[PDB]
């Protein structure tokens, strides 16, 4: 009793998730923050 078959399809998905995704989300956060700041920033006249 010793069966051995090798259909294993290894793929480097852990590295992609650990590396690309955090920087993509950081870039998205920075972009939305910049756009919001530019739309805002002195849209209101504080009279008196």
Query: Which residues sit at the interface with other proteins, rule CB under 8 A?
Result: 41-45, 47
Residue 9 or 45: which CB sits closer to other proteins? 45
Q: How far is the CB of 14 from other proteins (least distance, A)?
A: 46
Other CB atoms within 10 A of residue 23 CB: 9
- The least distance separating other proteins from the CB of residue 31, rounded to whole angstroms, comes to 19
Residue 9 or 42 having the CB closest to other proteins: 42
Ramachandran area for residue 24 (φ above 0: left; ψ -120 to 50: alpha; else beta): alpha
- Tokens 């756009």 -> residue: 35
Structure tokens at 22: 């955090």
């Amino acid at each position: 009793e010793v069966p051995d078959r090798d259909p294993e399809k290894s793929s480097e998905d852990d590295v992609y998730l650990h590396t690309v995704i955090p920087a993509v989300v950081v870039a998205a956060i920075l972009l939305i923050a910049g756009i919001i700041a530019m739309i805002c920033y002195r849209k209101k006249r504080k009279g008196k």
